[PDB]
Amino acid sequence: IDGYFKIYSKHTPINLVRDLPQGFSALEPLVDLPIGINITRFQTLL
Amino acid sequence: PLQSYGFQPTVGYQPYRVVVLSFELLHAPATVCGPKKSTNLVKNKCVNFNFNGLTGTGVLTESNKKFLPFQQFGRDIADTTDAVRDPQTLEILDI
Ligand SMILES: *[C@@H]1O[C@H](CO)[C@@H](O)[C@H](O)[C@H]1NC(C)=O
């Protein structure tokens, strides 16, 4: 958003079975850093 | 094809040692500035404070609010900067 690419992380002990239950947990910004480039495509590796 | 400095080590042909800091102001969001004087905070008397760029006047009375690490500053209802995180100490001061 507005040049600043903002990075958010959240680690939880959910271990399958539930299949994405009610995710009332918040999402804090781990870092908010100025990259400054538009994004419209990605791919998540594994 | 180029040239070469004729640097003879002996009187008016002494060059100078140069570093140039060229500036730009329209390429991206700002990423470089200068240091700002970290003047000591003052408690219990009305002062002219400027914290994290937020400007105002008030009494920076001691407080122990549980600000989360990413919470640069704080506010209250009605969009009022009731609290603020004073840096260099991660301490919370009630405005
Ligand atoms: C920055 O934080 C450290 C924490 O140990 C503190 O000692 C220092 O006074 C603070 N400010 C400066 C002047 O760097």
UniProtKB/Swiss-Prot annotation, chain B:
For the region Disordered, give the residue spans. 27-49
Q: What is the effect of changing Q3R?
A: In strain: Omicron/BA.1, Omicron/BA.2, Omicron/BA.2.12.1
Result when mutating Q8R = In strain: Omicron/BA.1, Omicron/BA.2, Omicron/BA.2.12.1, Omicron/BA.2.75, Omicron/BA.4, Omicron/BA.5, Omicron/BQ.1.1, Omicron/XBB.1.5, Omicron/EG.5.1
Per the UniProt entry, the effect of G6S is: In strain: Omicron/BA.1
Give the recorded effect for A78D: In strain: Alpha/B.1.1.7
Subunit info here reads:
Binds to host ACE2. RBD also interacts with the N-linked glycan on 'Asn-90' of ACE2. Cleavage of S generates a polybasic C-terminal sequence on S1 that binds to host Neuropilin-1 (NRP1) and Neuropilin-2 (NRP2) receptors. Interacts with host integrin alpha-5/beta-1 (ITGA5:ITGB1) and with ACE2 in complex with integrin alpha-5/beta-1 (ITGA5:ITGB1). May interact via cytoplasmic c-terminus with M protein. May interact (via N-terminus) with host bilirubin and biliverdin, thereby preventing antibody binding to the SARS-CoV-2 spike NTD via an allosteric mechanism.
Summary of the function given for this chain in its UniProt record: Attaches the virion to the cell membrane by interacting with host receptor, initiating the infection. The major receptor is host ACE2. When S2/S2' has been cleaved, binding to the receptor triggers direct fusion at the cell membrane. When S2/S2' has not been cleaved, binding to the receptor results in internalization of the virus by endocytosis using host TFRC and GRM2 and leading to fusion of the virion membrane with the host endosomal membrane. Alternatively, may use NRP1/NRP2 and integrin as entry receptors.
What is the protein's given name? Spike protein S1
Write down the species. Answer: Severe acute respiratory syndrome coronavirus 2 (2019-nCoV)
- Which lineage? Viruses, Riboviria, Orthornavirae, Pisuviricota, Pisoniviricetes
Tell me the gene name: S
